[PDB]
């Protein structure tokens, strides 16, 4: 019609601006000047919109929109009307499976790059030059909820990437945690349907504080060790951007020569590790179910790009049988103080899709998808997922081509005789679709392998034994690992874990359960058992508390990299400040604030009681972001308050509730001259306490005191404090 | 091994439990003896479990179901393995599309029946007699989610009904508002487009307050009726069996003289109309995302089934232009003071499904199923939802052949010439299969038009008009439904349907949008108009403060039946209250509160700060159902507080705050004895306030206080004091 405003604002600007400044867009309206080589490839497809006109799928041009073709302007609509029903159809018809596991997921286009060859270990293309680029597609995901679940729930979070590699796709389909919850991937369905809603009601989404789960860990040990994980504070990241990534598995790096170097798979996040705390984490579901898919898109519309570096544990073919627990056990992980990770590469995330559902949604990433230079080991849990990945994707994307939808295909060429199924893409023109064949002078051609370019061969590993279904009894042992990572973590960290146990065995209705729990939980740690029964009224018998404690793991008796926080790596660039305003707004205050949060890459959002603007005292007018209950202290990382006329919000229930709820998930506060009359709305002495910046005006070191707070995330020390306070 | 507990506490007890007392169950084995015909019917696939061996899908045997078949205990995974290959294979091919709209939904088995024979103006037969009962399924969902959303957002809520009839299937698929949105179904994508997730990135879910959803709405104002319903407290039910259910369009009632007459479908909910508050409502959908469902499934294992009077609005054929509205057109209600509702029957929903996948997900409902003494209009909207529901569903169900899954089965006879289609069951022995024939003698026949037991045949309406894609003229006006609307409503729900278009448009990042909206308010009503406005920190313009009101409807300047609350309708049986322990509860303050409770079918959940055990003084043991922090005020109606040792919770921050969020919430609070000593959390009042019940112990005076005021829901009189509470 010609609805947008006459000023053009409708229209996001394509350049790098921060969270909530612009209406979000698609990727290459975004930034049309990112490209890599897969983005590129993908301009076949890509479809515009402005200037054209609407039509049909068959090109015919729509006149009425508004309408169905009836008899009379009150009749009957008629069978005739093709438009409508084509209309109709494609609507009625948008609907795929969601994944089976992984449902819920958001994803990014990026590149990667490595430091230098890794010729002498693998001849895979990809790592052989420093120079070589190759594109990227990664998707971050929670493991239980659908697609339509919450973001911050407690859960293991998926980290897939895609590999557009000149050899082929590789998908580097890890967790963010490095051991999974189970062995044999026999069992994975009866785990996931443990951990899924119950079978009867649909109860409860994306949660594992449920019967099942906890019934199915209680008689099946080998899962602790990634319950221990997900109890922590790792269940519940502040993003995607600040977790660990892991391959979990022991894969094959294979070279030249011929020689297999054993090798687990980690990304280290370059804007460190920071988790929520679990009551932010649940209310943050309510608040905005859609936390971190916004929080990814925004960074990299800001340009805080989501940064890793892919790291490698390096295990020689000699050392196989070396530790105290197999390598091919997925429960167990690799201590890096036993096996550093030596330094790899960086992946750079820096583009928004431009197509959810085309490219997020049918994004398919499977494990088995290696290239030559890698390769699998007997890891049972591997072993099956080959089987899994293929097999769901007949369904989930309808047929055999799903490489052919857009952001499947490889960047590299493909060529082969398979020909057919449903939806087929490519229009083969070989005379031949067998091979031998002279028609075609046996075109395309096996390729031996070689040190580069040539055929994939698997590594000859020697295969010995019965065809037997037996679990290999190294693998038999299941407490240690959970122990070592409890006897890593601070004092605060085990505290989190035990509320976590605790909230969830509260949430089992059947007692037995929750104790059988705890007598497991007696077999790792007596005070972690303790603490968790004494949260459920529980007393360990006699024998529970003699009970003796797991070896520790090949002499480790704790491995401070297992933290989240022992070792600071805190980064303050793209994390986001709430300002509350008030309607006088001192502001040499706001300029000094603001000036030091842009300066290190700190986001501000302006809040108030109404949306529109107030006007500083010196007459600057203000734009607000959003009230003080639509965009609560869950969704920022510190609190700021500047002077000005603080009567004007200081009995505002939203305004001290805000307070309260960030002071009570240890979120650094900053209060400006006046705007100390807040202090005694979350008791905070004269004096003062660690974690509460302030001071006369927001001048001096006020910017760095409260900036030096949020490099170490959350205020540790507060915890106790906060045990009362009602919010 | 891992066998049930010694004392048989891992299954619940068959027979009806209060909410929490037991552990859930699917309803075949909760409550075997609760049958219907359909219900019967289902026995063919019911599938037990206890007593049997675990198997392939095949009938063979497994011996170990913990591991995969390798060629030695460390070695890989062998092909042959079929029975880990079927396994994995089915878990991969577990999900199919969820639905277009609607995806989240629960749903449950129940009986229908009329008060008295309907024959004068229809002879549908399962209106034709009194004491002859239609099984029912029932399904109630929200719109816009997924099916892994959250219950408690804001939203249309979807309410669809399957009579399994004698004379076919009937489903009756509406929604618990009397309009729809649009107008004409051409506008479906349009709209639920614009209300669902946006297209770059997929968020927000299962929300309008986004901006396409009001840009669309700003665009075309035939949508502001519906949105001023969802933006009421009706957007937000407190449970499922406390909402209206209306089947919006026009349909026709034909009685066996051929007699056409106009009726719009109603259900009116016999536990009353009631509703959550926003904030209530926004944090509940993180606290519990599955608590309608949750609900639903504990009311009905209660015996608290949920009860709905099946009324008709009928307007004889001659009255069909007497109105100031079309009666064709769906953005338009027919008040209740102009054409009264006519009690029809009732329906008893008493029976969760079994396998909430096979029943629920897999349920099919169409608006199109009708049938013979029933017939449709030319409602532009309905019209084009007969095409949709059968396209939709071979695509989401797979096939033709979806009538022939469970639940989606007629009890009565179907017999046809249709055959084959994707995953056929039924064997066709017919010897024909196209008619006519004579190599079966024609069978089956056609069956003449009649009464009773006779075949489909349209009424023959009168069709006038030339071939066009037209809005009809009379359909063209937006405003005075809005108006009436809002006008009837209570000062309190006003507020509240302002606070909810106030949040939802700070949430539209585009500025003017918000304003176009606000233009559109402007035209329906200048207060509420302003309202808003100032909300957003927007000034009307002169022109806008000169807008004329839209005209009355029929000369109604009000109608009562479209508030929630003008009316009381309270219906306490099946609430439930929050009763705050103490480690030495006052016995006889619980002896009482229980047995009033107990007297008005009213359900109680003990909590602490711990699970387990409290003692009460006189030895009872009370086990704790759930936390403070793990069953939030959200979660109940009500809260007591007993006396006992108060200083045991008197310094407890989530009892504190238990409170104060209840009171906040505007729900009735009980405080005995030394429990009193929390008025001072909820800052007010000494002599006592309306709403906070207080009394030296809980007697059976303090407990008729608490009853009355829950009768009235929630404490409408106390929002004034709400504002000011940090919670
Ligand atoms: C170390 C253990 C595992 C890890 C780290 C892992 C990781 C993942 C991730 C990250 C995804 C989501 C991919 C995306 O974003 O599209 C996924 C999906 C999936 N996983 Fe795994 N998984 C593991 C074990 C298994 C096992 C044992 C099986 C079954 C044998 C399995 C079967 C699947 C399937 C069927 C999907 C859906 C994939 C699709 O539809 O494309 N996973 N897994
Ligand atoms: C007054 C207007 C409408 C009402 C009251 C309504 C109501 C409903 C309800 C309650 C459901 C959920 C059924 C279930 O629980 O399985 C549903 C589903 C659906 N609706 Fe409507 N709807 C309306 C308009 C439309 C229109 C105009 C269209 C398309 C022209 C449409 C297309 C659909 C589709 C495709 C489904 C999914 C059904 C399935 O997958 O089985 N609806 N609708």
Same mark, same amino acid.
């Given at each position: ?215 199915? =860990? ?26 660990? #990534? ?124 290696? =290239? ?53 893409? #490519? ?125 520790? =793991? ?19 660039? #793209?994390?986001? =400040? ?55 202290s869950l969704t920022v990382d510190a609190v700021i308050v500047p002077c000005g006329n603080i009567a004007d919000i200081a009995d505002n229930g939203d305004a001290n509730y805000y307070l309260m709820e960030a002071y009570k998930h240890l979120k650094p506060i900053a209060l400006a001259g006046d705007a100390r009359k807040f202090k005694a709305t979350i008791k905070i002495a004269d004096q003062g306490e660690e974690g509460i910046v302030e001071a006369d005006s927001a001048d001096g070191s006020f910017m760095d005191e409260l900036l030096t707070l949020m490099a170490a995330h959350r205020v540790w020390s507060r915890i106790p404090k906060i045990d009362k306070i009602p919010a």
């Open positions: 019609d010609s609805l947008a405003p006459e000023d053009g604002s409708h229209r996001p600007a394509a350049e790098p601006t921060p969270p909530g400044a612009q209406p979000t867009a698609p990727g290459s309206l975004k930034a049309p000047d990112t490209r890599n080589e897969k983005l590129n490839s993908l301009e076949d497809v890509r479809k515009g919109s402005e200037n054209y006109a609407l039509t049909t799928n068959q090109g015919v041009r729509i006149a009425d929109d508004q309408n169905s073709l009836r008899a009379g302007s009150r009749g009957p609509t008629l069978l005739e009307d093709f438009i409508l029903r084509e209309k109709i159809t494609h609507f009625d018809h948008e609907r795929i499976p969601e994944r089976i596991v992984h449902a819920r997921g958001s994803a990014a286009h990026g590149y990667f790059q490595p430091y230098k060859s890794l010729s002498d270990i693998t001849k895979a293309d990809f790592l052989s030059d420093p120079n070589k680029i190759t594109p990227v597609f990664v998707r971050f995901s929670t493991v239980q909820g659908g697609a339509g679940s919450a973001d911050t729930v407690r859960a293991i979070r998926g980290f897939a990437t895609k590999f557009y590699t000149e050899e082929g796709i590789f998908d580097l389909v890890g967790n963010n945690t490095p051991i999974f919850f189970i062995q044999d991937a026999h069992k994975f369905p009866d785990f996931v349907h443990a951990v899924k809603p119950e079978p009867h009601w649909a109860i409860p989404q994306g949660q594992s504080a449920h019967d099942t789960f906890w019934d199915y =860990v209680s008689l099946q040990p080998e899962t602790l060790h990634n319950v221990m994980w997900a109890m922590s504070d790792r269940g519940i990241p502040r993003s995607y951007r600040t977790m660990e #990534g892991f391959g979990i598995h022991t894969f094959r790096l294979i070279n030249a020569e011929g020689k297999a170097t054993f090798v687990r798979f980690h990304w280290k996040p370059l804007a460190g590790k920071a988790s929520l705390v679990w009551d932010e984490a649940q209310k943050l579901t309510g608040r905005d179910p859609d936390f971190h898919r916004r929080e990814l898109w925004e960074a990299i519309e800001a340009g805080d790009f989501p940064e890793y570096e892919l790291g490698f544990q390096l295990i020689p073919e000699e050392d196989e049988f070396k530790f105290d627990f197999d390598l091919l056990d997925p429960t167990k992980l690799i201590p890096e103080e036993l096996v550093p990770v030596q330094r790899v590469g960086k992946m750079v995330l820096n583009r928004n899709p431009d197509n959810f559902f085309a490219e997020n949604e049918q994004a398919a990433f499977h494990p088995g998808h290696i =290239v030559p230079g890698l390769d699998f080991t007997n890891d049972p849990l591997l072993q099956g997922r080959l089987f899994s990945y293929t097999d769901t994707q007949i369904s989930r994307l309808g047929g055999p081509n799903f490489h052919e939808i857009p952001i499947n295909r490889p960047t590299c060429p493909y060529h082969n005789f398979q020909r057919d199924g449903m939806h087929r893409m #490519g229009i083969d023109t070989n005379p031949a679709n067998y091979e031998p064949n002279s028609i075609n002078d046996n075109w395309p051609r096996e390729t031996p392998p070689g040190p580069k370019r040539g055929g994939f061969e698997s590594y000859q590993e020697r295969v010995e034994g019965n065809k037997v279904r037996e679990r290999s009894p190294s693998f038999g042992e299941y407490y240690s690992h959970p122990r070592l990572f409890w006897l890593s973590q601070t004092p605060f960290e085990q505290r989190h874990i035990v509320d976590g146990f605790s909230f969830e065995l509260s949430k089992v209705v059947r007692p037995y359960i929750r104790e059988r729990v705890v007598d497991q939980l007696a077999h790792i740690d007596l005070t972690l058992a303790q603490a968790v029964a004494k949260n459920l009224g529980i007393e360990l018998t006699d024998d529970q508390l003699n009970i003796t404690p797991p070896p520790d =793991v090949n002499g480790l008796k704790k491995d401070p990299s297992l933290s989240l926080y022992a070792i600071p790596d805190g980064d303050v660039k #793209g994390r986001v =400040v709430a300002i509350l305003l008030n309607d006088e707004v001192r502001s040499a205050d706001l300029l000094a604030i603001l000036k030091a949060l842009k300066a290190k890459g700190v986001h501000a959002k302006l809040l108030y009681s109404r949306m529109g603007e107030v006007t500083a005292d010196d007459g600057t007018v203000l734009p607000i972001a959003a009230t003080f209950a639509g965009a609560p």
